[PDB]
GROMACS .gro file of C-alpha atoms in nm:
model
  271
    1UNK     CA    1 -10.277  -1.657  11.830
    2UNK     CA    2 -10.517  -1.608  12.124
    3UNK     CA    3 -10.352  -1.880  12.334
    4UNK     CA    4 -10.173  -1.814  12.665
    5UNK     CA    5  -9.795  -1.830  12.659
    6UNK     CA    6  -9.663  -2.095  12.896
    7UNK     CA    7  -9.324  -2.226  13.002
    8UNK     CA    8  -9.226  -2.506  13.238
    9UNK     CA    9  -9.120  -2.376  13.583
   10UNK     CA   10  -8.822  -2.615  13.561
   11UNK     CA   11  -8.692  -2.461  13.237
   12UNK     CA   12  -8.371  -2.331  13.397
   13UNK     CA   13  -8.243  -2.670  13.514
   14UNK     CA   14  -8.342  -2.839  13.187
   15UNK     CA   15  -8.154  -2.579  12.982
   16UNK     CA   16  -7.842  -2.602  13.199
   17UNK     CA   17  -7.825  -2.983  13.169
   18UNK     CA   18  -7.935  -3.013  12.805
   19UNK     CA   19  -7.589  -3.108  12.671
   20UNK     CA   20  -7.529  -3.416  12.887
   21UNK     CA   21  -7.760  -3.645  12.689
   22UNK     CA   22  -7.654  -3.570  12.326
   23UNK     CA   23  -7.288  -3.583  12.432
   24UNK     CA   24  -7.348  -3.911  12.615
   25UNK     CA   25  -7.484  -4.065  12.292
   26UNK     CA   26  -7.220  -3.928  12.055
   27UNK     CA   27  -7.443  -3.670  11.888
   28UNK     CA   28  -7.223  -3.379  12.003
   29UNK     CA   29  -6.849  -3.445  11.991
   30UNK     CA   30  -6.680  -3.102  12.006
   31UNK     CA   31  -6.700  -2.790  12.219
   32UNK     CA   32  -6.787  -2.591  11.906
   33UNK     CA   33  -7.078  -2.823  11.827
   34UNK     CA   34  -7.192  -2.789  12.189
   35UNK     CA   35  -7.196  -2.409  12.163
   36UNK     CA   36  -7.374  -2.428  11.828
   37UNK     CA   37  -7.635  -2.650  11.993
   38UNK     CA   38  -7.679  -2.409  12.286
   39UNK     CA   39  -7.744  -2.128  12.038
   40UNK     CA   40  -8.047  -2.316  11.905
   41UNK     CA   41  -8.254  -2.261  12.219
   42UNK     CA   42  -8.384  -2.618  12.205
   43UNK     CA   43  -8.445  -2.670  12.577
   44UNK     CA   44  -8.626  -2.335  12.578
   45UNK     CA   45  -8.845  -2.459  12.292
   46UNK     CA   46  -8.919  -2.786  12.473
   47UNK     CA   47  -9.010  -2.597  12.792
   48UNK     CA   48  -9.280  -2.414  12.593
   49UNK     CA   49  -9.406  -2.721  12.407
   50UNK     CA   50  -9.425  -2.901  12.744
   51UNK     CA   51  -9.485  -2.645  13.022
   52UNK     CA   52  -9.673  -2.913  13.219
   53UNK     CA   53  -9.355  -3.124  13.241
   54UNK     CA   54  -9.071  -3.102  13.493
   55UNK     CA   55  -8.771  -3.314  13.579
   56UNK     CA   56  -8.712  -3.631  13.379
   57UNK     CA   57  -9.035  -3.583  13.182
   58UNK     CA   58  -8.918  -3.240  13.065
   59UNK     CA   59  -8.570  -3.380  12.994
   60UNK     CA   60  -8.729  -3.624  12.749
   61UNK     CA   61  -8.886  -3.325  12.575
   62UNK     CA   62  -8.554  -3.140  12.560
   63UNK     CA   63  -8.380  -3.450  12.422
   64UNK     CA   64  -8.640  -3.485  12.146
   65UNK     CA   65  -8.587  -3.124  12.039
   66UNK     CA   66  -8.210  -3.174  12.070
   67UNK     CA   67  -8.219  -3.494  11.863
   68UNK     CA   68  -8.451  -3.348  11.600
   69UNK     CA   69  -8.235  -3.049  11.510
   70UNK     CA   70  -7.920  -3.263  11.527
   71UNK     CA   71  -8.096  -3.510  11.296
   72UNK     CA   72  -8.216  -3.250  11.045
   73UNK     CA   73  -7.867  -3.098  11.020
   74UNK     CA   74  -7.729  -3.426  10.883
   75UNK     CA   75  -7.930  -3.368  10.562
   76UNK     CA   76  -7.822  -3.010  10.482
   77UNK     CA   77  -7.521  -3.119  10.277
   78UNK     CA   78  -7.490  -3.349   9.976
   79UNK     CA   79  -7.703  -3.620  10.141
   80UNK     CA   80  -8.008  -3.391  10.134
   81UNK     CA   81  -8.054  -3.380   9.757
   82UNK     CA   82  -7.977  -3.755   9.741
   83UNK     CA   83  -8.310  -3.934   9.805
   84UNK     CA   84  -8.146  -4.277   9.827
   85UNK     CA   85  -7.900  -4.158  10.092
   86UNK     CA   86  -8.184  -3.986  10.279
   87UNK     CA   87  -8.388  -4.307  10.289
   88UNK     CA   88  -8.068  -4.496  10.377
   89UNK     CA   89  -8.021  -4.301  10.700
   90UNK     CA   90  -8.390  -4.266  10.792
   91UNK     CA   91  -8.442  -4.642  10.754
   92UNK     CA   92  -8.169  -4.700  11.013
   93UNK     CA   93  -8.334  -4.448  11.247
   94UNK     CA   94  -8.691  -4.571  11.195
   95UNK     CA   95  -8.568  -4.928  11.249
   96UNK     CA   96  -8.563  -4.844  11.621
   97UNK     CA   97  -8.944  -4.856  11.610
   98UNK     CA   98  -8.934  -5.226  11.515
   99UNK     CA   99  -8.681  -5.351  11.771
  100UNK     CA  100  -8.329  -5.318  11.909
  101UNK     CA  101  -8.075  -5.162  11.681
  102UNK     CA  102  -7.745  -5.323  11.583
  103UNK     CA  103  -7.438  -5.176  11.749
  104UNK     CA  104  -7.322  -5.057  11.405
  105UNK     CA  105  -7.615  -4.815  11.381
  106UNK     CA  106  -7.506  -4.449  11.355
  107UNK     CA  107  -7.525  -4.239  11.674
  108UNK     CA  108  -7.828  -4.044  11.548
  109UNK     CA  109  -8.015  -4.376  11.535
  110UNK     CA  110  -7.910  -4.483  11.885
  111UNK     CA  111  -8.018  -4.137  12.000
  112UNK     CA  112  -8.367  -4.180  11.855
  113UNK     CA  113  -8.389  -4.532  12.002
  114UNK     CA  114  -8.320  -4.391  12.349
  115UNK     CA  115  -8.592  -4.129  12.302
  116UNK     CA  116  -8.842  -4.382  12.166
  117UNK     CA  117  -8.765  -4.624  12.450
  118UNK     CA  118  -8.839  -4.351  12.705
  119UNK     CA  119  -9.140  -4.226  12.507
  120UNK     CA  120  -9.321  -4.559  12.530
  121UNK     CA  121  -9.249  -4.675  12.886
  122UNK     CA  122  -9.568  -4.634  13.088
  123UNK     CA  123  -9.802  -4.578  12.791
  124UNK     CA  124 -10.058  -4.823  12.659
  125UNK     CA  125  -9.941  -5.050  12.374
  126UNK     CA  126 -10.201  -4.896  12.142
  127UNK     CA  127 -10.061  -4.549  12.213
  128UNK     CA  128  -9.713  -4.679  12.130
  129UNK     CA  129  -9.826  -4.830  11.799
  130UNK     CA  130 -10.005  -4.509  11.704
  131UNK     CA  131  -9.704  -4.297  11.802
  132UNK     CA  132  -9.479  -4.535  11.607
  133UNK     CA  133  -9.694  -4.486  11.296
  134UNK     CA  134  -9.664  -4.109  11.339
  135UNK     CA  135  -9.285  -4.141  11.335
  136UNK     CA  136  -9.295  -4.360  11.024
  137UNK     CA  137  -9.523  -4.104  10.859
  138UNK     CA  138  -9.262  -3.837  10.932
  139UNK     CA  139  -8.965  -4.037  10.803
  140UNK     CA  140  -9.155  -4.147  10.491
  141UNK     CA  141  -9.253  -3.786  10.427
  142UNK     CA  142  -8.892  -3.685  10.492
  143UNK     CA  143  -8.778  -3.917  10.212
  144UNK     CA  144  -9.062  -3.803   9.985
  145UNK     CA  145  -8.957  -3.441  10.032
  146UNK     CA  146  -8.598  -3.531   9.941
  147UNK     CA  147  -8.728  -3.703   9.626
  148UNK     CA  148  -8.882  -3.369   9.520
  149UNK     CA  149  -8.535  -3.232   9.433
  150UNK     CA  150  -9.952  -2.398   9.756
  151UNK     CA  151 -10.188  -2.696   9.772
  152UNK     CA  152  -9.918  -2.940   9.658
  153UNK     CA  153  -9.660  -2.783   9.892
  154UNK     CA  154  -9.894  -2.806  10.193
  155UNK     CA  155  -9.975  -3.175  10.141
  156UNK     CA  156  -9.603  -3.257  10.152
  157UNK     CA  157  -9.488  -3.033  10.438
  158UNK     CA  158  -9.773  -3.149  10.664
  159UNK     CA  159  -9.570  -3.466  10.724
  160UNK     CA  160  -9.221  -3.312  10.750
  161UNK     CA  161  -9.310  -3.026  10.986
  162UNK     CA  162  -9.307  -3.287  11.264
  163UNK     CA  163  -9.594  -3.149  11.472
  164UNK     CA  164  -9.760  -3.484  11.546
  165UNK     CA  165  -9.456  -3.653  11.711
  166UNK     CA  166  -9.410  -3.330  11.907
  167UNK     CA  167  -9.772  -3.341  12.025
  168UNK     CA  168  -9.737  -3.713  12.104
  169UNK     CA  169  -9.452  -3.641  12.344
  170UNK     CA  170  -9.668  -3.391  12.534
  171UNK     CA  171  -9.897  -3.684  12.622
  172UNK     CA  172  -9.602  -3.889  12.747
  173UNK     CA  173  -9.440  -3.592  12.923
  174UNK     CA  174  -9.778  -3.527  13.086
  175UNK     CA  175  -9.837  -3.896  13.167
  176UNK     CA  176 -10.185  -3.888  13.014
  177UNK     CA  177 -10.349  -4.021  12.698
  178UNK     CA  178 -10.629  -3.847  12.514
  179UNK     CA  179 -10.907  -4.104  12.455
  180UNK     CA  180 -10.798  -4.287  12.142
  181UNK     CA  181 -11.145  -4.274  11.984
  182UNK     CA  182 -11.143  -3.895  12.029
  183UNK     CA  183 -10.795  -3.865  11.877
  184UNK     CA  184 -10.937  -4.027  11.562
  185UNK     CA  185 -11.243  -3.800  11.564
  186UNK     CA  186 -11.298  -3.562  11.275
  187UNK     CA  187 -11.298  -3.268  11.517
  188UNK     CA  188 -10.967  -3.353  11.683
  189UNK     CA  189 -10.818  -3.444  11.345
  190UNK     CA  190 -10.917  -3.098  11.224
  191UNK     CA  191 -10.766  -2.936  11.534
  192UNK     CA  192 -10.440  -3.125  11.479
  193UNK     CA  193 -10.423  -3.026  11.112
  194UNK     CA  194 -10.461  -2.660  11.214
  195UNK     CA  195 -10.168  -2.707  11.452
  196UNK     CA  196  -9.970  -2.860  11.164
  197UNK     CA  197 -10.055  -2.580  10.921
  198UNK     CA  198  -9.988  -2.295  11.166
  199UNK     CA  199  -9.648  -2.439  11.259
  200UNK     CA  200  -9.577  -2.477  10.887
  201UNK     CA  201  -9.673  -2.118  10.801
  202UNK     CA  202  -9.493  -1.972  11.104
  203UNK     CA  203  -9.181  -2.173  11.015
  204UNK     CA  204  -9.154  -2.047  10.656
  205UNK     CA  205  -9.206  -1.689  10.777
  206UNK     CA  206  -8.922  -1.724  11.028
  207UNK     CA  207  -8.713  -1.917  10.772
  208UNK     CA  208  -8.756  -1.654  10.500
  209UNK     CA  209  -8.396  -1.530  10.533
  210UNK     CA  210  -8.257  -1.821  10.329
  211UNK     CA  211  -9.095  -2.208  10.089
  212UNK     CA  212  -9.463  -2.116  10.118
  213UNK     CA  213  -9.418  -1.745  10.040
  214UNK     CA  214  -9.251  -1.837   9.709
  215UNK     CA  215 -10.193  -1.374  10.298
  216UNK     CA  216 -10.008  -1.624  10.517
  217UNK     CA  217 -10.094  -1.422  10.828
  218UNK     CA  218 -10.459  -1.422  10.720
  219UNK     CA  219 -10.438  -1.801  10.686
  220UNK     CA  220 -10.296  -1.831  11.038
  221UNK     CA  221 -10.570  -1.598  11.164
  222UNK     CA  222 -10.851  -1.783  10.986
  223UNK     CA  223 -10.718  -2.118  11.108
  224UNK     CA  224 -10.689  -1.998  11.469
  225UNK     CA  225 -11.046  -1.865  11.457
  226UNK     CA  226 -11.157  -2.206  11.329
  227UNK     CA  227 -10.950  -2.376  11.599
  228UNK     CA  228 -11.159  -2.201  11.864
  229UNK     CA  229 -11.481  -2.313  11.695
  230UNK     CA  230 -11.354  -2.672  11.694
  231UNK     CA  231 -11.264  -2.641  12.063
  232UNK     CA  232 -11.621  -2.540  12.149
  233UNK     CA  233 -11.743  -2.864  11.988
  234UNK     CA  234 -11.534  -3.075  12.227
  235UNK     CA  235 -11.802  -3.096  12.503
  236UNK     CA  236 -12.042  -3.246  12.249
  237UNK     CA  237 -11.765  -3.463  12.101
  238UNK     CA  238 -11.707  -3.600  12.450
  239UNK     CA  239 -12.075  -3.689  12.474
  240UNK     CA  240 -12.080  -3.851  12.129
  241UNK     CA  241 -11.797  -4.084  12.233
  242UNK     CA  242 -11.945  -4.127  12.584
  243UNK     CA  243 -11.634  -4.020  12.774
  244UNK     CA  244 -11.635  -4.082  13.148
  245UNK     CA  245 -11.485  -3.840  13.402
  246UNK     CA  246 -11.119  -3.938  13.364
  247UNK     CA  247 -11.147  -3.945  12.984
  248UNK     CA  248 -11.295  -3.594  12.977
  249UNK     CA  249 -11.005  -3.477  13.194
  250UNK     CA  250 -10.749  -3.641  12.965
  251UNK     CA  251 -10.916  -3.479  12.663
  252UNK     CA  252 -10.897  -3.141  12.837
  253UNK     CA  253 -10.528  -3.193  12.914
  254UNK     CA  254 -10.467  -3.287  12.550
  255UNK     CA  255 -10.641  -2.967  12.439
  256UNK     CA  256 -10.444  -2.738  12.672
  257UNK     CA  257 -10.109  -2.914  12.725
  258UNK     CA  258 -10.052  -3.079  12.384
  259UNK     CA  259 -10.244  -2.908  12.104
  260UNK     CA  260 -10.246  -2.548  12.230
  261UNK     CA  261  -9.883  -2.572  12.343
  262UNK     CA  262  -9.756  -2.686  12.002
  263UNK     CA  263  -9.935  -2.388  11.845
  264UNK     CA  264  -9.831  -2.119  12.094
  265UNK     CA  265  -9.495  -2.273  12.185
  266UNK     CA  266  -9.340  -2.242  11.839
  267UNK     CA  267  -9.476  -1.888  11.804
  268UNK     CA  268  -9.321  -1.767  12.130
  269UNK     CA  269  -8.996  -1.954  12.060
  270UNK     CA  270  -8.949  -1.779  11.725
  271UNK     CA  271  -8.997  -1.442  11.897
   0.00000   0.00000   0.00000
């Protein structure tokens, strides 16, 4: 992975204060759960996904990582092999995308609603709708993966790896938006799928002590070499979509602070 390792200069404060939010929303209710959370290194991970963020913007990134691993842990028991119970909980979470939640919603849903509320404030409505669809794609794929209990395994895990909502938050944490017509471009779509696949392959390698392996390094290498080719096309892609000066700068920030960070950030976090 020929991408520079980066970490937010405010990582120390964000890691020290990471527990206040999930405790405030009832996601962490015991000192043992707090210590188990601290052992995950989730603020550290967020500080590498979002090195361009500090302060409240970085805190939103930490909270997303915090929420996501707290969320995923709720499905590692009997409710994981139960597709109806999986969809039952994810529907209550994803309902936050459509409007206010009822007070009876479980804490994990109120946690997501607080993240989604913060994620959208200040962004264009079209960015919000597109980011909302990315969340629905994840939750739908999360249910589909529960219903299932190389080519077929990849098509399923590309939704549940959760790269796209992670990349989306880098835009919000950076207070920029890649031009929407470039996001939909075949070149950017190919760059994003590489980011999805590399995170997927690197995850199953690190999660082997417990799957794709059941050649992977060559696939990560070939995809990263193609990622650089696709990056070199971006100047011409910017011309094809007639980007002005600010749009070219937002596209550059997306390339360096959102796409590259989600590729390199997970690699450095695992190590």
